[PDB]
Ligand binder design. Sequence first.
Ligand SMILES: OC[C@H]1O[C@@H](S[C@@H]2O[C@H](CO)[C@H](O)[C@H](O)[C@H]2O)[C@H](O)[C@@H](O)[C@H]1O
Ligand SMILES: OC[C@H]1O[C@@H](S[C@@H]2O[C@H](CO)[C@H](O)[C@H](O)[C@H]2O)[C@H](O)[C@@H](O)[C@H]1O
Lengths: 134, 134
Amino acid sequence: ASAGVAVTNLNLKPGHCVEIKGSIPPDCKGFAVNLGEDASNFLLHFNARFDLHGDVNKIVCNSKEADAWGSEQREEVFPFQQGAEVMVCFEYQTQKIIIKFSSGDQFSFPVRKVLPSIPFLSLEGLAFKSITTE
Amino acid sequence: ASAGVAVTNLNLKPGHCVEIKGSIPPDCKGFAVNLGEDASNFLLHFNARFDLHGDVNKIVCNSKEADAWGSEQREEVFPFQQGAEVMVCFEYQTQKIIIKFSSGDQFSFPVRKVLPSIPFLSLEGLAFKSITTE
Ligand SMILES: OC[C@H]1O[C@@H](S[C@@H]2O[C@H](CO)[C@H](O)[C@H](O)[C@H]2O)[C@H](O)[C@@H](O)[C@H]1O
Ligand SMILES: OC[C@H]1O[C@@H](S[C@@H]2O[C@H](CO)[C@H](O)[C@H](O)[C@H]2O)[C@H](O)[C@@H](O)[C@H]1O
């Protein structure tokens, strides 16, 4: 019940973070937060699947390069429920991106292409409330 | 040189608002916040001029359609300091856009074109910190 917001010139630099605060529709099959250069190049594609692509309550991360998906990293921790409010924070480190939830849960993804700064961010299926940088 | 963040798919419908928060450089001649359809069509171009084009500490507002600027509406209230943080909110109503300053100050600008929703937002010469919809 939505189409995601897109942000350009975010210019996220190593050692900094982006915190998204949003709301999950009560029939959301899954939602995604993409950090990259454009819709064909993602350093991180964070996908929380409620029931989608054969995944039920599972987090799938991956990168994309020239429209081609890399190898997925699945995560067991799934602190979400349809209709709730998400509060995610992404810290950019040259080696990895640390994802932290208000739940107290944390995990990282490895950086496969170091960027001097990250210019693009987009959301899907997530009704955005506020986006912040630090 | 120095523009900034551009948000697309903002989907601001009447009766809703967006609050921008950011940092003003210490040597800032002026900054802007744009709302509209794209880079050539602004329902509102909000330009706070510290010292620009003969306007010193003034606020100039205008609309733009197909790169052609419309009638400027100047304002004398200027609650901004260089090298400091700012926070502005824009409320969209089908007939006018209400602009409010952290200072309690407020004024409106007429909607010269009613859009079912407002798709685009961009900042120029203002360091982005956060954007919040309500
Ligand atoms: O990797 C993220 C993308 O995942 C696919 S669904 C993906 O499909 C492959 C087959 O190509 C395998 O079945 C995986 O098990 C499955 O996760 C999505 O369609 C994309 O939008 C990304 O989310
Ligand atoms: O209307 C806001 C835009 O104003 C121009 S500067 C503008 O120039 C016209 C003539 O071309 C008149 O002199 C106006 O008095 C003067 O303000 C800016 O370059 C744009 O960025 C908008 O701020």
